[PDB]
Amino acid sequence: ATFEIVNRCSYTVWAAASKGDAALDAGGRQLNSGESWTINVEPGTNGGKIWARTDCYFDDSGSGICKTGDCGGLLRCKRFGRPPTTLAEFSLNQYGKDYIDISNIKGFNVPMDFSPTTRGCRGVRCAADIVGQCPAKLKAPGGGCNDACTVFQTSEYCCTTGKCGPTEYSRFFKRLCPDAFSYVLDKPTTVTCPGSSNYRVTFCPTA
């Protein structure tokens, strides 16, 4: 499958793509404002994620740091990033279908649209000003709006026991972005697409 990753933000982001134990394609790249990066993701990929990283500094060897979404200090991510990270999530060719969603379960850093470029399903978007409206206790100094599990590490926020409800904090994310997951047991906002669809992820789709 092809993913086109587009930075429509006015600031540079460092895109990342991983399935947790491996890079997808090159795993990461700098995207200046307006730039597009096309990657190829193997059919059958389960549990892939794409996200943006902000305020990064990398040396010639591809080693450094980012203020949001850092993946162990690498430009080319092999593992998932440090919250807060708005997440585009996908599993491809699962018994004939692709499944896509956006998640705020690991917080929010950059607004996002995640849409098919082929026919058969709709896209999803979270483009509200979550960072500007972020509750004081969830604000991340480096930028972004943390999820409550990251901040407070309780069974209820992290849904550790497999039983948990919505919370004041999850409802904040859900109010601003109804079409994204706001906590682990949220009513699913997953979209089902035809197997082997292609996609575009756009950072700052309205900004």
Swiss-Prot record:
Keywords for this protein: Cytoplasmic vesicle, Disulfide bond, Signal, Taste-modifying protein
Is the keyword Disulfide bond assigned to this protein?
A: yes
The record's listing under InterPro entries reads: Osmotin/thaumatin-like_sf (IPR037176), Thaumatin (IPR001938), Thaumatin_CS (IPR017949)
Keyword Disulfide bond in record = yes
One Pfam family name is Thaumatin
Q: Where in the cell is it found?
A: Cytoplasmic vesicle
GO cellular component, alphabetical, reads: cytoplasmic vesicle
Which Cys pairs are S-S linked?
9-204, 56-66, 71-77, 121-193, 126-177, 134-145, 149-158, 159-164
Per the record, the domain of life is Eukaryota
What does the record give as the function of this protein? Answer: Taste-modifying protein; intensely sweet-tasting. It is 100000 times sweeter than sucrose on a molar basis.
Annotated family: Belongs to the thaumatin family.
Q: What is the protein name stated in its UniProt record?
A: Thaumatin I
